[PDB]
Design a protein around this ligand. Sequence first.
Ligand SMILES: Cn1cc(CC(=O)O)c2ccccc21
Ligand SMILES: Cn1cc(CC(=O)O)c2ccccc21
Lengths: 642, 645
Amino acid sequence: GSVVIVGRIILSSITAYSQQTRGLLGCIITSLTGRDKNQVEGEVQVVSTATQSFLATCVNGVCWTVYHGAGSKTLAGPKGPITQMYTNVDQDLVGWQAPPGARSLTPCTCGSSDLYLVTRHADVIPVRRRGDSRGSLLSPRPVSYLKGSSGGPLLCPSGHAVGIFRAAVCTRGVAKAVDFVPVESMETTMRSPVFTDNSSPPAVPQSFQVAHLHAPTGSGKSTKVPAAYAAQGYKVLVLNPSVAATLGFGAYMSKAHGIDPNIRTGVRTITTGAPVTYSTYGKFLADGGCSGGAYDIIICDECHSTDSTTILGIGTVLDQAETAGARLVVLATATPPGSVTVPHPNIEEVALSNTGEIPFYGKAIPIEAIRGGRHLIFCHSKKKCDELAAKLSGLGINAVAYYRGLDVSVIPTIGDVVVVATDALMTGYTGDFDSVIDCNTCVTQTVDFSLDPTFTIETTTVPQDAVSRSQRRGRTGRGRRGIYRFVTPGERPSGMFDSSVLCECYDAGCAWYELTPAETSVRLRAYLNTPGLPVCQDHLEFWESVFTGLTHIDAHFLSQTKQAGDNFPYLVAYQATVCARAQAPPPSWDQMWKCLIRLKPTLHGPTPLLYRLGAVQNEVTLTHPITKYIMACMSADLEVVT
Amino acid sequence: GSVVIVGRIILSGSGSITAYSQQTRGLLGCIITSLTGRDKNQVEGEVQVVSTATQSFLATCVNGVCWTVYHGAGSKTLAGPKGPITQMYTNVDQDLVGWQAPPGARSLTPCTCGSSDLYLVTRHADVIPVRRRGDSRGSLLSPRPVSYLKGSSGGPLLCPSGHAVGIFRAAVCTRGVAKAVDFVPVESMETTMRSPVFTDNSSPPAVPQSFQVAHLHAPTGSGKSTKVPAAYAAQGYKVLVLNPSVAATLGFGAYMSKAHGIDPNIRTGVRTITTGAPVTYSTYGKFLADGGCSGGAYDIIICDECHSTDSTTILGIGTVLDQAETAGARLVVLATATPPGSVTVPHPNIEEVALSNTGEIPFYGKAIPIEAIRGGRHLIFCHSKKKCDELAAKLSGLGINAVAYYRGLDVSVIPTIGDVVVVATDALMTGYTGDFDSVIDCNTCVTQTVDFSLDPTFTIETTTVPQDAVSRSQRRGRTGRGRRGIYRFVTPGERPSGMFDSSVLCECYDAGCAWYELTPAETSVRLRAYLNTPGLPVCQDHLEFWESVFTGLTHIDAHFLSQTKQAGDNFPYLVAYQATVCARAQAPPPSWDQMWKCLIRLKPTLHGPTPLLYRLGAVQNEVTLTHPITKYIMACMSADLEVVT
Ligand SMILES: Cn1cc(CC(=O)O)c2ccccc21
Ligand SMILES: Cn1cc(CC(=O)O)c2ccccc21
């Protein structure tokens, strides 16, 4: 789908009023076609994706809005859809050349502090400038009031543009201030190149440089280029988020380039004294980070990964490399933020239909598409993998499930196989397949600042992003012809991750890498402060405060939660600890709370509840000093998207 | 639009019950078929995935009828192969609608074994084991989050044999965890199929020998509250007529003497008259104030505008139903033009006109042309006091004679005689009785919803919503009164009529305590009477829960209570109780919004966190959750609350 203009806010002492122009079927036809033949008027537009609705502002003949709304989407145009002229994921800003009929705001000249926010309902809201990019609501309002209004203008009293609205600063759900993209950031963006080239790798400079490398997987970005660099006399470190891939790099290098490198994974370590090391992000973290004077180049490969260990690993590299003697860091990926899935020459893309013996996600797979040869099926959940795998095994198809917890060796290396796998496959297993069949969904975790008493980590099934889609399909076409079959054509925007992932970082810092909340903050801030990386609301102070007060965990409970491989081993073990000491039962008797099963006869009364990680079946008490500490943490200013 | 079949669940033919889904229409195809009402795809399967332009859910074919929930499907047609299928059955009480299924539609049949091991088929084709615990209940074998059961209402509960026990309609929660399921049993569907499709309630009933409840579904202006009291009284009966509005109450009384030659008794706050006539016009408010039914006084009780879902009307009809047989009445008539399930049909007098973007006057994403309103008498429906003020100011500027009217203003502001454009909230239709040359409708209103949010207790959220079939009809019918009229609108759409929020029940306990000296227990009896009487607006039964809350709200400050009552805003009792706790703690209120004005004079003396009991709006101050009363309401939240899926 394209973005669709569904109406407009008209502007006059500033006043505003709205006009609707499209309906539901009008929005959805024009989204599918990309052809909007309807005449654009005014300087603020009301815009829609079939998911969401927001605002767009014309300044300098560019119609502008928020990346967190528009993503990399086309805008529906008279002569078909409009490619975005500008994309700045770092600034949460996108832009299309203004349609005919559209007027523009002129940027703000004279330095006014008294500002006016235009909302999607056409209310004009007094705002006092505080920073380059912050203004504070003269009268605070529910955060709900401001939702639907991002991309909207902040005007000075002259009616010129100060910038566009992107986020609300919040105290226990009440919006106190506004975050905005300043009109000066649009001019920098308009000045920046149409296309920058990062296909070719940098040259090792005189002083420290952070560089970016955008190139296909298996171009040589993690094989040819390290060897190339080492040929020049350099010591290089290669970081990857997969054990399987890290391991495999060792045997390929010693064949391809005569370098028998050092391999560092949790499971296995090889020290050869070569000038190339391959390490995982976790093993790099578990190691202490940057070994003083050990490396000239660090290559952070697969830097599009938004799992806690990658973000924490990369952040560590950016905080340490320059002091630890490095000259070059880089950041390597085939799918940077703001990328979209484009045709690949070696891959046939075929949508599924309702014709098929095997039901798949409301569509069907014909048994003839998978009967012989090697095929891979992405399911979103462990439960689906087992169901599907069972079906096909009954049909006589050589089928196997793979997910977190299972050993890789369930997947046969050599025969006919259907591998029914979650994304866990893409860290356990290196191989390529004849076809890939994709459900186009994954399971993600969202933080909810629910004040019932504190926060919640929800687990939801969501549409895949453009990174997922491409990484998944990239399991076929590897220098040979592959098919890709899919349930839905869609993709949500690449390059953003949830605040829960920051929580995951502090947790893993504490559980695995013996990192203080303060030291985690140092590392994440580097990741956050570096452009070209995935983006996230800055809730570093908030999570640091939360984990900072989580003291004297039971180490035995810690061991057990770590051993089990739960998400948030630290958050779970700390609840367990609190329950033990309070002599009170756990939130429920789910497998999460296995470690307390030995105390089940003595624990009674209400749960000293800290935060919600799943279902809560017992009564709760808000009296624990710790619950009280976290409740107080909730009063922090949190930037939430509108 | 119509309900559209977008897919199906396929249930295993053999052995263990297992299901898979097929998707048969994508989103655009769904939207077109909603508008055409034409769907020439063959209906395969017994269980169908259905969608409206808002929600999605399930529909099961049983015995030739395709059944789903009223709360999902309202009174909508079903997109069929010869265009849209009207509903054969609409049961708002059972929460059950039925369309005749397309020919050769695969249908289920009821179960003949009478087994207690049951299986719920969910919208993503999970077969969940349920244990039968009643006629309409079953318990989950392992409890699950209630979010998991969402969009699965209208789906089957199956015996191990694969035949239909019932259709799923709601989950029973403890604090967001679903512990049990409420369904409509398969015999309640055969009751229905054996019974007449068509009923008549257009005529006032004959007075029965012994006590009976009867419905009068007749237009306003067939004299349901003038002509029919008079004819009952001419037959020699004593009649009491109850109405939500004091303007209407006084207005019918003054007409009754003018026309039908009885000076009736009148009972309202503002004016009370005893003549000794066998006809009494009273408001529901004044009736409750009087202590409800006084024995031997009336043979007939007309509960008029019985569609009204304000706390006083529900309390009123609850009282009449609980008391009237015992007070020796022979007949209760629940009279309305717009009963539950009803739909807006054309009117002969009213030309309907869809507002465009061509006009000088912006209105709700559209435009009013001054030509339309420049002379004569016009009424403009607006969801808020803000918009009324805003538009009357624009129209005053455009030089149109424009008065704003809403709750807190004197009906005297509107001229009876002259050229006028009154810009009103729905406060109009209870405060003012007159009609108009045209009516303009924004097609939205403001409503209250409860959310059991556990932050610490509950939220009453105030929201802006699409209007329902009841609103549209009452608003529209303020024009075309026995002459021509023009109804101008923003939206063709209307939501389903005859359902109200659990927040209204809260309002009934609140009015009980604040106005009518009812113990919570006294209110639960009155409300039960309403709830178990069919043919009235329906609501999730949260009586035990609301009762439990209010029962612990003892020793309110009487002063604050009188200040919140006078001020006329919603929940005077929950507001005056929150302020009581605050003042006695020397704590400031949740905000310094108009709500908390009764604490303003004490602002300097008020310090520290608010001892927060519940959320009635924005909370700006720091809170404490230590108050004995917060703890009591927290403890109430553990009650089995039924919620729709
Ligand atoms: C959490 N975590 C992930 C890894 C990756 C790996 O297995 O190499 C790791 C390694 C050592 C210590 C902790 C580790
Ligand atoms: C809340 N409330 C509404 C009414 C209706 C009326 O004014 O007739 C009423 C009457 C007496 C006491 C309280 C009352």
